[PDB]
Amino acid sequence: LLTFPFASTGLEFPPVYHELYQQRLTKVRLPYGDDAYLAIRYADVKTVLSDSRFSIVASLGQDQPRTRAGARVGNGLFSLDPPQHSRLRSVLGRDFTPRRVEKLRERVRELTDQCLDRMEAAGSPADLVAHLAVPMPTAVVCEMMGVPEPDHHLFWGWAETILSNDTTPDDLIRRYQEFTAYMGAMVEERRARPTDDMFGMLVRACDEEGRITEIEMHALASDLLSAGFVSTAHQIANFTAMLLARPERLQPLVDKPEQIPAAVEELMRHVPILSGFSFPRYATEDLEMSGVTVRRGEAVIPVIAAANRDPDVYPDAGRLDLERNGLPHLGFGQGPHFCIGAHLARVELQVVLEALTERFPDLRFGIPENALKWKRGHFMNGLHELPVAW
Ligand code: HEM
Numbered sequence: 001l002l003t004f005p006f007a008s009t010g011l012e013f014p015p016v017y018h019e020l021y022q023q024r025l026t027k028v029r030l031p032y033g034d035d036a037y038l039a040i041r042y043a044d045v046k047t048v049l050s051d052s053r054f055s056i057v058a059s060l061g062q063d064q065p066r067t068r069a070g071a072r073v074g075n076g077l078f079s080l081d082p083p084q085h086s087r088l089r090s091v092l093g094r095d096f097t098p099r100r101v102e103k104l105r106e107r108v109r110e111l112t113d114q115c116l117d118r119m120e121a122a123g124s125p126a127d128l129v130a131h132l133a134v135p136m137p138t139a140v141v142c143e144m145m146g147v148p149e150p151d152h153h154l155f156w157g158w159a160e161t162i163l164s165n166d167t168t169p170d171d172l173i174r175r176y177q178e179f180t181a182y183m184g185a186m187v188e189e190r191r192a193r194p195t196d197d198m199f200g201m202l203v204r205a206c207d208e209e210g211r212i213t214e215i216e217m218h219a220l221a222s223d224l225l226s227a228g229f230v231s232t233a234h235q236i237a238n239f240t241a242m243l244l245a246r247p248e249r250l251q252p253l254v255d256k257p258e259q260i261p262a263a264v265e266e267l268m269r270h271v272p273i274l275s276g277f278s279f280p281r282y283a284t285e286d287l288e289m290s291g292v293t294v295r296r297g298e299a300v301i302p303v304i305a306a307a308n309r310d311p312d313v314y315p316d317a318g319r320l321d322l323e324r325n326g327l328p329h330l331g332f333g334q335g336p337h338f339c340i341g342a343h344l345a346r347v348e349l350q351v352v353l354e355a356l357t358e359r360f361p362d363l364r365f366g367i368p369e370n371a372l373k374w375k376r377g378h379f380m381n382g383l384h385e386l387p388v389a390w
């Protein structure tokens, strides 16, 4: 069988997809676990993520298709189908609606400003990744939850083990052991004095309301502290890099600040954030997909990066047109597991571009472009460093 993931470097979209779009659904072999079909068409990836005939749970003895040694199993939102998924997620729901998240815009700019003060203080050329991409989204969610600043490094280390393809079940055991004790302390302390942060709301939901159990309370906090900043950090650098590599660099968004939200959406469609793939889904009944009968139990991988370049949904899909304003990308997913932080991420990315254009309109790469240190063979695509000058 065709091997997957496919060869690519940086944010390169590999040409093999232009072949597969014209072809029927094709089966592939993965680094670990069972084989799977590759959903790449826009409508198919949508069906995998939102049709109730595709379950995220391997309830038929499947060995999960994956790029990581130890399979991704736990008690959080990615381990559940509706309605069970829907009940647990509703514990967090109200805190991530657009109405709640628009309120954080001011603070997001505050932290973004503080990061750039430090970056500018360090002198040109400086590493945008270390000075902004990493600290800002980390600070945002950690202070949403109630995690103090000097412990941020701990949650970065835990998050990277989850996302590293060389993680064994043993490392995941270690992470789990270390994360449970740390959150174990915050629980005791919030039981000994309430606080108006988000982990404190989880403690009320477990202890006062009986809505959730202790391990569910822990799981939800793990989900948000694992999925909640590393992806944004990668995108801040990926987006800036895409923009700085063009002749006009940031000038168009300097000239037309009102077009920043669209640029954020276009970049979300264009950037192949993933080197691997997310969770496979499993057909719960026989069904037809791009000329193939997918049988009950068989796995299908939703390749978000290919959906976002469907040749019939997006004309000239390889072109980054910040005015494209195309049909809705699947970059935050779709259906039940559609990113709970989608708006927070849009807010974070919009503000970063506001602050960078208003402050460094002549931003530019600080090293030659071909010297850039793209991460090789990682789960997410991105940069080890992003030197910038101004
Ligand atoms: C650019 C930044 C981000 C991107 C590209 C992104 C993308 C995604 C995607 C595509 C999914 C669905 C994956 C699948 O269904 O297989 C997802 C799920 C999730 N994301 Fe995000 N996300 C981003 C930022 C965030 C932020 C800021 C948060 C903060 C809460 C977050 C928390 C989550 C959680 C908890 C889930 C699982 C939800 C569920 O299973 O119900 N992500 N993300």
Ligand SMILES: CC[C@H]1[C@@H]2C=C[C@@H]3[C@H]4C/C=C\C(=O)NCCC[C@@H]5NC(=O)/C(=C(O)/C=C/[C@@H]4C[C@@H]3[C@H]2C[C@H]1C)C5=O
Binding pocket: 071, 072, 073, 074, 075, 076, 078, 079, 162, 172, 219, 222, 223, 224, 226, 227, 228, 231, 273, 274, 277, 278, 279
């Ligand atoms: C740019 C967007 C990214 C996105 C960003 C973060 C998510 C990752 C982290 C989310 C949750 C999390 O760790 N919770 C702790 C429970 C343990 C449980 N046990 C596992 O082993 C496990 C995983 O490995 C999960 C991997 C998630 C892949 C997700 C990524 C897919 C892309 C679309 C579990 O869910």
